Amino acid sequence: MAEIYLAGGCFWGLEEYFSRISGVLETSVGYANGQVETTNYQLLKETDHAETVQVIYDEKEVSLREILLYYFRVIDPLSINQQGNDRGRQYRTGIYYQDEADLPAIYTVVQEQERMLGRKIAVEVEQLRHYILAEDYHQDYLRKNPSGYCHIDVTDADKPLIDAANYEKPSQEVLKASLSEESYRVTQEAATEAPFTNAYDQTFEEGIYVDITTGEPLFFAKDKFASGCGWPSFSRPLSKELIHYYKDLSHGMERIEVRSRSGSAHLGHVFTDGPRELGGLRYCINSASLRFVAKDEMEKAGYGYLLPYLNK
């Protein structure tokens, strides 16, 4: 009995995507917040309505915040009246609410988005004025024509959702007093541990590696490979948002430095000499900036929601 209305471009892909998200009970597509009481896919282009998707979910199973995160993961937030190759006001981005009690959650996700991007977003936030169900040929479109027009990776709905809010970075001081001089110098400075004497260079055990600084998941064990370069090497991170990249001209070389999202801890560098079949990337990470959490102790810790992904 909990719902939220989202506008993020052509509603076909958006509905298929949300229907595939744990916790969603029902979905439907329609036309919302236009300049007239009603409309239809024919008069849409003239009634100023926005293609919208209705998401009905179990507050207990999935949060409004989580839904918005999955939302921002699949739309272009700075784009004005355009998603993919569809242009027009009916493709404008929007979050339409019914109860004012949802504002704090919405505003929080919206501002977090604008802080990360350093600029205001094009996504509009307003009260739902009226939602008109779309003609039956639209409803569950990809659920009828599995191979139809779709400009968003509908399987992203199945990839893990790691919320940065859960791994707030500690104060600069609480850190300097909580982690080894090694972890501090490497993590808070551009320090790099000794090549072969670190803890995870040879580690190959089931589980996940976390940001020693914040506890934010960084790498799955399945993506770690044998390198012998000296430092633990991964072919990729759990999710792409988890890593920030920077140009490093230090030590007479030109390479790509890598840092964690939440916490912005220095981790090491990424190269393109990794196993070809795995993407070709080699994320060379210092053991000192990671905290390995084996599969056993995963649930007990707060990473149980990641167990379903450990398997290849």
Binding site: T192, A194, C229, G230, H251, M253, R255, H269, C284
Partner: peptide
């Protein structure tokens, strides 16, 4: 010795 650094990463390379």
């Amino acid at each position: 010795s650094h990463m390379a």
